[PDB]
Symmetry: D2
Subunit: 208 residues, 4 copies
Amino acid sequence: MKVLVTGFEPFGGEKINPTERIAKDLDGIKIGDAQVFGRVLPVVFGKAKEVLEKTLEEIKPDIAIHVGLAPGRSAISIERIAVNAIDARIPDNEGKKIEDEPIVPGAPTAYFSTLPIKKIMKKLHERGIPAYISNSAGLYLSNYVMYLSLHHSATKGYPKMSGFIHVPYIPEQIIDKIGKGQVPPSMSYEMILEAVKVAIEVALEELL
Amino acid sequence: MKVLVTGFEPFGGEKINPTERIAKDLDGIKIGDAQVFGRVLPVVFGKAKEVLEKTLEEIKPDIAIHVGLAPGRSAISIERIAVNAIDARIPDNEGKKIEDEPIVPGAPTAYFSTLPIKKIMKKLHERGIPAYISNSAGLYLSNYVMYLSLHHSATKGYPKMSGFIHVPYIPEQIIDKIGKGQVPPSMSYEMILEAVKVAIEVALEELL
Amino acid sequence: MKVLVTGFEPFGGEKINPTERIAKDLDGIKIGDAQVFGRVLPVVFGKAKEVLEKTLEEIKPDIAIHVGLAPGRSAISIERIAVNAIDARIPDNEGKKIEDEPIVPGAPTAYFSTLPIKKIMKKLHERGIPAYISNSAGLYLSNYVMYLSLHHSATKGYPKMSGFIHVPYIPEQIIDKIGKGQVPPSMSYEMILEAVKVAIEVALEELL
Amino acid sequence: MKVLVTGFEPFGGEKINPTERIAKDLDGIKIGDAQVFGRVLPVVFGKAKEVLEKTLEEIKPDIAIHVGLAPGRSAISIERIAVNAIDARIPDNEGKKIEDEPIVPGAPTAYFSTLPIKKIMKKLHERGIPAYISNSAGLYLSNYVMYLSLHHSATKGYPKMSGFIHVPYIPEQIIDKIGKGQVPPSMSYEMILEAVKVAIEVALEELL
């Protein structure tokens, strides 16, 4: 049993992206006898696809859990659906702002996450971790990777389960926002890290 | 040097009020050679005034820092001003919903907090704790106690410094909110507790 | 040329649903030589499908624009995608709260709206009407009807264009919310009505 | 009977300030036999005080209703209190960003609005206009003028009634916000104008 967990590098002016640390922290750990691999993806259209594809082919995970930062969200959110479209509100890290373009021409308009999202949400709640089901992962890089992963699963037969989890800003990221007149929600890094570990465990238990 | 820190009991249907634990956790601790006293106040008009007054007279603190829960707020908020008015959106724990009534007839319309609010905010930021200055503590029990404390200071000469700090819900309080279709912001209990300790230290350092 | 515009009856405790009046106000009007039909749909799973299907078969519109109330949204929102799923946060008007169930088993995971959404948004902006593209119509009755309409189009060949538009609460609906301690955004009924008329005109101009 | 209504010029990068039009639209009208005067104030500390003072001395209104734009607010808000402090989050139109400074050294920490705020709110509700009582007018120019007007009343004996009303953005102001990734609430200019007229009528009826 192999699990791939991905995070993203900093973007949009932020100095950090908590999911980058999540990926690095979880890389190499084991849950039961399952091996976990953690990889960081660039917040760049095209390049992110290449890295994602190469990583999936290299590791051939049974489960893929892609994690990303969702500025403004107040709790862990588990994405229900990936959409075959790109409509960036802001450019990627290479200055590319793609508008109204499919991710994979001719492929399905959307794919449902194959992670046991409701069970994951329920377990998180039991652990005292606020979490809910999101019905839109946006149309930026998070959705981009989510869709490509699910498309890979439908086309290659692996990973068996694939999904996306968005996390709030961590507290330290809020500091310089205060002066800018606005205080978005945040969640401790420790809680977010534990949330991802829980998602992995629940996904694994769901498998065979 | 004596410091009084107060918290509130649960209210509005909530099973807990994190500031109650804060008061109990801080009671009896010492910062430098300063003695800290922690007391829990009832979320009841009239009764809260009695307890507050008796506590202030009993301990005669040099510094009073009153803490309360502010449902929906995303970061620590330091109250700048206390208003001589009661206009409860919800009833107190005794079912009393007082509307448009002064707290102390004939007394000043308002009192500015005498805690070094900007310095406290700055120190919190340096510690990676999101915090900002609130210009309204509401017109429920938090403002009620804040005003009475400052009025006590102006009338009795002590405490020398008095102010109010509102804290967000802690994560576990968000769980049953999710089903109700809504996810308010939260902050770890550990961070909130540390924030109050920091406020006390900064206030003390400001003193003499 | 025939255009079908639908609205919904009141739901969730609300005394009114502004889209009900929209449908009635637009029923029978003509834009150019195009005939407009306005119909109100029940906020009930199953029954809404029956009414929708019968209405589409009866009128056989070239364009279908389904309108609904989106509590909390601050501007007109044009739905980009319909999802093949039902996961009601609240029950329908018959007390039915369907969770994780496809709308049409075996049908596509999703359908993109075939209305010229970007052009509609642009025209609204030119008219001084705030509007944006929504990437999730929720998974309640709005999405339910949106999906069924698009599925009807893909399966029957008509309507040629189909989409959904969500509108904010109108001001009078906010009044009793104030006491409940919360003030959601609102938009005048006149502006919302004009927005729908504009969407129809833009859709028609896009046709042949 | 004379009524003074003031509005503010554009500020903070905005091309317009709806309260400027309100002041101009209401200038010269009569409600019953009461004469209404409308004046626009600069969003500049110091200068705004001069204009306000000269205007009050020139007209000597019995009632003064100062109106301002409150970006982000979703409904009409009637200010309950003016605070003797300036702490600008942004600079004024002259680039002056005053921090922690009293408006009138030695004067009261605050003044309660003398407009019949609850009656005004109630009448607005009856007219289907969302409105609520705000407990902080901020510490920028709105609060600045509100405090000075009330101080003038307490010191000079006129106006007999003075208060402040904040209004949301009007729809056209939201357009360029959408691209910036964010959609604040708005209210039609017509409703805002009517709200101010209602406030004036209620204030007048309250007088003698």
